[PDB]
Write a protein that holds these residues in place. Structure first.
Motif, PDB file in Angstrom:
ATOM      1  N   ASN A   7       0.827  -1.204   0.000  1.00 24.14           N
ATOM      2  CA  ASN A   7       0.000   0.000   0.000  1.00 24.14           C
ATOM      3  C   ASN A   7       0.864   1.257   0.000  1.00 24.14           C
ATOM      4  O   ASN A   7       0.596   2.206  -0.747  1.00 24.14           O
TER       5      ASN A   7
ATOM      6  N   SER B 182      -5.950  -3.366  16.881  1.00 20.39           N
ATOM      7  CA  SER B 182      -5.714  -2.150  16.109  1.00 20.39           C
ATOM      8  C   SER B 182      -4.765  -2.442  14.956  1.00 20.39           C
ATOM      9  O   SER B 182      -3.574  -2.687  15.168  1.00 20.39           O
ATOM     10  N   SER B 184      -6.089  -4.375  11.882  1.00 18.59           N
ATOM     11  CA  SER B 184      -6.527  -5.656  11.348  1.00 18.59           C
ATOM     12  C   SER B 184      -7.343  -5.521  10.071  1.00 18.59           C
ATOM     13  O   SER B 184      -7.851  -6.525   9.566  1.00 18.59           O
ATOM     14  N   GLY B 185      -7.485  -4.315   9.535  1.00 18.55           N
ATOM     15  CA  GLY B 185      -8.190  -4.130   8.286  1.00 18.55           C
ATOM     16  C   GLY B 185      -9.689  -3.985   8.390  1.00 18.55           C
ATOM     17  O   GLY B 185     -10.378  -4.185   7.387  1.00 18.55           O
ATOM     18  N   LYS B 186     -10.217  -3.627   9.561  1.00 20.43           N
ATOM     19  CA  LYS B 186     -11.665  -3.549   9.734  1.00 20.43           C
ATOM     20  C   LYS B 186     -12.260  -2.396   8.934  1.00 20.43           C
ATOM     21  O   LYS B 186     -13.258  -2.569   8.218  1.00 20.43           O
ATOM     22  N   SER B 187     -11.664  -1.209   9.052  1.00 19.18           N
ATOM     23  CA  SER B 187     -12.209  -0.030   8.389  1.00 19.18           C
ATOM     24  C   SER B 187     -12.102  -0.156   6.877  1.00 19.18           C
ATOM     25  O   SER B 187     -13.065   0.119   6.152  1.00 19.18           O
TER      26      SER B 187
HETATM   27  N1  LIG Z   1      -5.997  -4.819   1.633  1.00 21.13           N
HETATM   28  C1  LIG Z   1      -5.061  -3.959   2.044  1.00 21.13           C
HETATM   29  N2  LIG Z   1      -3.952  -3.806   1.290  1.00 21.13           N
HETATM   30  C2  LIG Z   1      -3.012  -2.948   1.695  1.00 21.13           C
HETATM   31  N3  LIG Z   1      -2.998  -2.178   2.783  1.00 21.13           N
HETATM   32  C3  LIG Z   1      -4.106  -2.348   3.509  1.00 21.13           C
HETATM   33  C4  LIG Z   1      -5.161  -3.196   3.222  1.00 21.13           C
HETATM   34  N4  LIG Z   1      -6.140  -3.111   4.200  1.00 21.13           N
HETATM   35  C5  LIG Z   1      -5.660  -2.227   5.039  1.00 21.13           C
HETATM   36  N5  LIG Z   1      -4.437  -1.725   4.686  1.00 21.13           N
HETATM   37  C6  LIG Z   1      -3.653  -0.741   5.420  1.00 21.13           C
HETATM   38  O1  LIG Z   1      -3.829  -0.988   6.797  1.00 21.13           O
HETATM   39  C7  LIG Z   1      -3.879   0.268   7.493  1.00 21.13           C
HETATM   40  C8  LIG Z   1      -4.619   0.080   8.790  1.00 21.13           C
HETATM   41  O2  LIG Z   1      -5.831   0.858   8.746  1.00 21.13           O
HETATM   42  P1  LIG Z   1      -7.241   0.176   8.923  1.00 21.13           P
HETATM   43  O3  LIG Z   1      -8.312   1.125   8.564  1.00 21.13           O
HETATM   44  O4  LIG Z   1      -7.219  -1.130   8.149  1.00 21.13           O
HETATM   45  O5  LIG Z   1      -7.273  -0.191  10.455  1.00 21.13           O
HETATM   46  P2  LIG Z   1      -8.338  -0.769  11.485  1.00 21.13           P
HETATM   47  O6  LIG Z   1      -8.406  -2.238  11.453  1.00 21.13           O
HETATM   48  O7  LIG Z   1      -9.644  -0.029  11.229  1.00 21.13           O
HETATM   49  O8  LIG Z   1      -7.785  -0.235  12.855  1.00 21.13           O
HETATM   50  P3  LIG Z   1      -8.247   0.667  14.073  1.00 21.13           P
HETATM   51  O9  LIG Z   1      -8.831  -0.319  15.079  1.00 21.13           O
HETATM   52  O10 LIG Z   1      -6.951   1.242  14.632  1.00 21.13           O
HETATM   53  O11 LIG Z   1      -9.217   1.699  13.612  1.00 21.13           O
HETATM   54  C9  LIG Z   1      -4.546   1.221   6.513  1.00 21.13           C
HETATM   55  O12 LIG Z   1      -4.113   2.556   6.740  1.00 21.13           O
HETATM   56  C10 LIG Z   1      -4.063   0.713   5.149  1.00 21.13           C
HETATM   57  O13 LIG Z   1      -2.952   1.468   4.679  1.00 21.13           O
END
Ligand SMILES: Nc1ncnc2c1ncn2[C@@H]1O[C@H](COP(=O)(O)OP(=O)(O)OP(=O)(O)O)[C@@H](O)[C@H]1O
Ligand SMILES: Nc1ncnc2c1ncn2[C@@H]1O[C@H](COP(=O)(O)OP(=O)(O)O)[C@@H](O)[C@H]1O
Ligand SMILES: [Mg+2]
Ligand SMILES: [Mg+2]
Lengths: 78, 229, 246, 236
Positions: A7, B182, B184-187
């Motif tokens: 990414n 925190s 894990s790719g949820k958002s």
């Molecule tokens: N499929 C993917 N390919 C590449 N990078 C990714 C992918 N999914 C997520 N990311 C990266 O992972 C980072 C983590 O952000 P993300 O929104 O996934 O966190 P989260 O699980 O919502 O965490 P939080 O609990 O801290 O809000 C993002 O900024 C993005 O750059």
């Protein structure tokens, strides 16, 4: 971690820092030369794996470390 | 107040009777056998799986599984009539149990759940897939917003599988929790799911993101003024 | 200074807590329950030993106090059980001494379990009940193991108890058994030397088996034969029961 | 057309739906008595009846028919076996109809009928297992029994719902299809306790851990008696 590396490298190769361009070409060259270290295990993943057992003040999170790293590399390109 | 109300202690509902009567009403030849195999299965999963804060195997989960089993039985009947009589009811229950419990499970508990499923239902098996259009739209959106897509064994395989599980939960459920550490790719998962669903079904997706701890509960739900109502 | 006395007791404590083997590919329900229980016990042991070593270093040595260490030291001096270690059921808030003794006994039992597993042989090992983190899971794994071994239905198995897996540490309350025949007694509690748990598909006095003297955590239910002159209603009124720890 | 005030014609609408449901229930239970006088029943005319009447009306008419038949049998073990056989053959035709493909609303009505008829079958089986001679025995008084009086001059007071020492009137509120609950013995104990509390003009406070059946059993009793049940989620 290689997904996050991909990414960062994609967002470096495209979407130039100024809101083709010479800065975009510099970003592409920087991504091309930093690809071998980021890809596979490389330097960064082994460094993280070692730095997890080093004691810190605040609890260490890989996304905090990589956000710091990506901002520093954007500063290097600038 | 206590003298104005009559108290009744409800602690143990007859889950076996509930499952048996409800499966009989939904329509199942082996309804009694299915209930006698599905209620002790939930009792088994209550203890032999790992203990987690987000785990639940109560009456709500059992009824959700049974309702989804009835729904997938009806849709399979419709598909066969498109292409009836004897149907794999045990496979139907296995599909419902997997679709409702597998996303909830930690990575070390999926083999345990599948071992329990093979123990209870011997001729069970599984069938996961046939989401090609949504997978293609997911790949398009992931390539659009600089994300990596996986085929199941590639780098993005686990993330894409979790996105598909999230889609299934949205389809057959009412409210959702995306529990995870925190980073894990949820958002990104729910964002690309919303965008891909918009691209597929044409209906525009709107997402309101509220932080409930950044504001007081009175600012989150509302207030009644003590002076005027 | 109370710190010197706390350090002395603190050095006294971990001589009964040294190390646990983590022990891992089998589909037996007994082994599955035992491996999850031993992994949670190993995590608890590591946490407790790390906490004790931290307090040793901070008191009888050189280490700056953190907020967690201050809270832990305050709880240890006050003598109440810290909430950081209460990962299983404790009877009505036992003291730190009693909790440490019970934990050390449980760790010795887990060390014996790990030794037997290393040598499966887990079928015939004589295993207590009060020393397990989740005795209900042990009974469920018992039922699943016998159901898989004999290859019939799990939901149609009755329980017959003869004074078949060995369970020790059980104690009656208000009665005693004479060759699988309960007799009313005026004693507070009578120990049980040996109990086996046979499973059969299909005036008997049925009794609860609680976790401790609080009679709040029911584990499972046993069946026993009545004496000739006694009465099941008399047993129910007198409130005879079995406890896993007394 | 006369254009009264909005509250006035809404009140007229409310009273009209109440009397409409009362009249529909009266003609429905007449139809059920006609159907259930015989032992064997025709699935075609049964399905036409299901499509003819509303969901709460068909469920309650089945309840009335079963209660009246079992009370007649108790007044007089042969008639009790007869009513058990009638319930069993109704279960058979319902099971066949639900195995066949149906429109969704008819399917929901069939599911509600199957649940209620399973409960009635279990109660009648227990009543066979016990040796019950007269209709005044508490083993029958405990169950929720329905009484329909066609000679009542008021349409809204024609139906009386009875429990063990409790008289109730049906609210005749239009509830939709709702969702019938599987009649657990815990649910029967809840019905007994809550109806005793209501006969004592008290409230009702079921308690226990989450996901047990408290709110749903309260709502199911309210819908069985035909009342409007509003759930309020209290907080500070
Ligand atoms: N499929 C993917 N390919 C590449 N990078 C990714 C992918 N999914 C997520 N990311 C990266 O992972 C980072 C983590 O952000 P993300 O929104 O996934 O966190 P989260 O699980 O919502 O965490 P939080 O609990 O801290 O809000 C993002 O900024 C993005 O750059
Ligand atoms: N007798 C029953 N028949 C069918 N389903 C039931 C029965 N009792 C409870 N349930 C189901 O169990 C779940 C329990 O939820 P609910 O009773 O609303 O929670 P609570 O009462 O603890 O607030 C509900 O989804 C309900 O549909
Ligand atoms: Mg996020
Ligand atoms: Mg509730």
């Amino acid at each position: 971690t290689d997904m996050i590396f991909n990414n960062f490298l994609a967002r470096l190769r495209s979407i130039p820092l100024d809101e083709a361009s010479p800065m975009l070409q510099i970003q592409r060259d920087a991504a091309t030369i930093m690809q071998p270290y980021f890809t596979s295990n490389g330097l960064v993943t082994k460094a993280l794996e070692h730095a997890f057992q080093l004691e810190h003040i605040m609890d260490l999170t890989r996304l905090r470390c990589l956000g710091s790293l990506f901002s520093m590399l954007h500063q290097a390109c600038r | 107040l206590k003298k104005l109300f009559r108290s009744l202690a409800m602690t143990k509902p007859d889950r076996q009777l509930i499952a048996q009567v409800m499966l009989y009403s939904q329509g199942f030849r082996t309804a009694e056998v299915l209930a006698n195999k599905i209620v002790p299965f939930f009792k088994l999963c209550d203890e032999q799986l790992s203990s987690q804060s987000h785990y639940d195997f109560g009456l709500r989960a059992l009824k959700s599984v049974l309702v989804s089993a009835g729904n997938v039985k009806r849709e399979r009947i419709q598909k066969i009539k498109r292409e009836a009589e004897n149907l794999p009811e045990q496979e139907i229950l296995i599909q419902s149990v997997c679709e409702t419990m597998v996303p909830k499970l930690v990575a070390e508990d999926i083999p345990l759940l599948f071992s329990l499923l093979s123990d209870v239902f011997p001729g069970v098996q599984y069938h996961r897939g046939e989401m090609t259009a949504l997978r293609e739209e997911l790949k398009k959106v992931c390539q659009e917003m600089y994300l990596t897509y996986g085929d199941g064994e590639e780098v993005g395989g686990m993330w894409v599988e979790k996105v598909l599980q999230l889609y299934q939960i949205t389809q057959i459920n009412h409210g959702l929790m995306m529990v995870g550490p925190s980073g894990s790719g949820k958002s990104m998962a729910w964002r690309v799911l919303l965008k891909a669903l918009e691209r597929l079904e044409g209906v525009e997706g709107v997402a309101h993101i509220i932080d409930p701890k950044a504001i007081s509960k009175d600012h989150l739900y509302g207030t009644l003024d003590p002076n005027t109502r | 200074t109370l710190h010197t006395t706390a350090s002395n007791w603190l050095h006294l404590i971990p001589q009964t807590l040294s190390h646990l083997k983590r022990t891992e590919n089998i589909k037996d329900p007994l082994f599955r329950f035992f491996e999850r229980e031993v992994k949670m016990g190993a995590k608890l042991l590591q946490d407790v030993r790390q906490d004790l070593a931290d307090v040793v270093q901070v008191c009888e040595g050189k280490k700056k106090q953190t907020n967690y260490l201050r809270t832990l030291i305050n709880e240890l001096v006050k003598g109440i059980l810290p909430r950081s270690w209460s990962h299983y059921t404790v009877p009505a808030g036992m003291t730190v001494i009693q909790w440490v003794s019970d934990f050390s006994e449980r760790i010795k039992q887990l060390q014996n379990i790990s030794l037997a597993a290393a040598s499966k042989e887990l079928k015939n090992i004589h295993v207590c009940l009060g020393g397990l983190f989740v005795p209900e899971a042990y009974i469920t794994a018992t039922r699943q193991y016998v159901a898989q071994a004999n290859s019939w239905s799990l939901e149609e198995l009755c329980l017959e108890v003869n004074v078949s897996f060995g369970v020790t540490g059980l104690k009656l309350q208000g009665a005693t058994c004479n060759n699988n025949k309960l007799s009313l007694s005026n004693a507070i509690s009578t120990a049980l030397p040996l109990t086996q748990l046979r499973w059969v598909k299909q005036s008997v006095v049925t009794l609860p088996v609680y976790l401790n003297f609080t009679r709040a955590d029911l584990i499972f239910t046993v069946d026993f034969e009545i004496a000739t002159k006694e009465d099941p209603r008399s047993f129910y009124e007198r409130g005879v029961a079995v406890l896993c720890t007394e | 057309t006369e254009h009264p005030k909005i509250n006035e014609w809404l009140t007229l609408v409310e009273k009209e739906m109440r009397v409409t449901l009362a009249k529909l229930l009266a003609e429905s239970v007449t139809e059920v008595e006609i159907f259930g006088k015989a032992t064997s029943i025709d699935p075609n005319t049964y399905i036409t009846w299901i499509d003819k009447y509303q969901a709460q009306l068909v469920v309650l008419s089945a309840q009335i028919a079963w209660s009246e038949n079992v009370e007649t049998a108790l007044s007089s073990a042969a008639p009790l076996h007869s009513v058990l056989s009638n319930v069993e053959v109704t279960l058979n035709v319902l099971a066949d109809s639900v195995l066949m493909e149906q429109p969704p609303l008819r399917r929901r009505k069939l599911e509600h009928l199957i649940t209620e008829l399973v409960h009635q079958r279990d109660v009648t089986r227990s009543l066979i297992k016990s040796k019950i001679d007269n209709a005044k025995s508490f083993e029958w008084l405990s169950q929720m029994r329905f009484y329909f009086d066609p000679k009542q001059t008021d349409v809204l007071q024609q139906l009386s719902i009875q429990m063990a020492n409790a008289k109730f009137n049906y609210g005749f509120e239009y509830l939709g299809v709702q969702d019938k609950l599987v009649q657990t013995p815990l649910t029967d104990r809840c019905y007994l306790t809550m109806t005793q509390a209501l006969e004592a003009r008290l409230g009702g406070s079921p308690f226990g851990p989450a996901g047990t059946g408290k709110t749903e059993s309260v709502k199911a009793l309210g819908h069985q008696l035909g009342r409007f049940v509003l759930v309020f989620n209290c907080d500070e």
